[PDB]
């Protein structure tokens, strides 16, 4: 009747409480970073996606996400930042962009 | 037919208890039996295959009938006496299909307790007493 | 060893794609008769050079849609509109069998 393998739910909720708390910081900071690229302020979002970048690739050491998509959640961010900084954007160098 | 049966157990005063061994004289309860109904003998493996005594087959005949109290009770007596007439070893009636009054046979000759009480109390069918019919040669 | 199979253009009514059927020969596995059957293989046309009524060559690629797998590599010849009639008259022969 009883089984000692009920522990796996008590790692499932205990680690779901961590992963659910970590996955919001990718797209929340990413959409908040891509909004400021439309606003015009570049260095603010360039300060944002260093911490968001740290919360992508530093979160890529556990088991939340470390795949080719772990590179693409950052690649869509730094991809979609750089286009709209040309129509009167004055692209300076913060931390994210390499050029 | 020989099969493996045993798993011998019995009732206690309040619950069930199971025994591994059982010997002569003692009696008890057994599961796993297939089709040997009561009134029959089961013997061992290297047994002399002996059959017991007291196979109660008398031959009584009793003229009696029924009154099913309504006018459409033929289907319910014809449906209930099918499953009811199998416990009574005497079920030869030969009712002439001309009218109602579905006659049940007579074995114990006071057989309300085996047919009519087990039809009103057990099977929930109301009935009364009826009358037979003569036949001149 | 991706297969390189020749098809014919019968319709380019939808943009950025062509409706190409491929004729092929195979004997019957029981009666043994070389009969010609066809099956339409929708291919992508990014250059818009293959017009209506062409004979194209087909190479398989990574799929972009439901029911698209192939693309056009080369044209062998072109201009034979009579085979396009040899499909499309069967398109205007289906309406004569109805209620």
């Amino acid at each position: 009747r009883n089984l000692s393998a009920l522990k796996r739910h008590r790692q499932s909720l205990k680690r779901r409480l961590r992963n659910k708390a970590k996955k919001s910081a990718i797209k929340t900071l990413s959409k908040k970073a891509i909004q400021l690229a439309q606003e015009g302020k570049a260095e603010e979002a360039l300060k944002i996606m260093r911490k968001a970048e740290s919360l992508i690739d530093k979160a890529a050491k556990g088991s939340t996400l470390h795949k080719n998509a772990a590179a693409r959640r950052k690649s869509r961010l730094m991809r979609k930042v750089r286009q709209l900084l040309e129509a009167a954007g004055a692209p300076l160098i913060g931390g994210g962009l390499s050029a | 037919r020989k099969e493996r049966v045993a798993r011998l157990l019995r009732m206690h005063a309040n619950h069930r208890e199971e025994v591994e061994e059982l010997k002569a004289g003692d009696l008890g309860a057994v599961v796993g039996l297939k089709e040997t109904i009561t009134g029959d003998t089961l013997v061992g493996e290297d047994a002399p295959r002996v059959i017991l005594e007291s196979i109660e087959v008398p031959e009584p005949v009793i003229d009696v009938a029924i009154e099913p109290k309504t006018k459409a009770d033929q289907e319910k007596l014809s449906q209930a006496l099918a499953r009811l007439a199998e416990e009574d070893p005497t079920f030869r009636v030969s009712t002439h299909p001309e009218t109602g009054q579905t006659i049940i046979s007579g074995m114990g000759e006071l057989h309300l307790e085996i047919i009519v009480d087990r039809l009103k109390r057990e099977f929930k069918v109301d009935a009364n007493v009826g009358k037979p019919q003569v036949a001149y040669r | 060893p991706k297969k390189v199979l020749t098809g014919v253009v019968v319709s380019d009514k939808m943009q950025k794609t062509v409706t190409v059927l491929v004729e092929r020969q195979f004997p019957h596995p029981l009666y043994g008769k070389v009969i010609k059957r066809s099956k339409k293989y929708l291919a992508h046309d990014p250059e818009e050079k293959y017009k209506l009524g062409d004979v194209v060559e087909i190479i398989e690629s990574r799929p972009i849609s439901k029911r698209k797998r192939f693309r056009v590599l080369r044209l062998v010849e072109s201009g034979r509109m009579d085979l396009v009639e040899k499909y499309l008259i069967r398109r205007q022969n289906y309406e004569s069998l109805s209620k």
Partner: protein
Amino acid sequence: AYIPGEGHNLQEHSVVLIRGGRVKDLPGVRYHIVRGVYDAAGVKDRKKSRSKYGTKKPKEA
């Protein structure tokens, strides 16, 4: 259904196991009855087609 053999032992509420086949000279019958089931016992004095009509060994005396 058809009843084979020299008579039978059947009632109105009888459980009759069926076999099948056909009977040639009857208009609707296409079933046979195996004698040897617990409501259709075989006919006595039967020792030539004994397993076909379902009786045990005729005991000597």
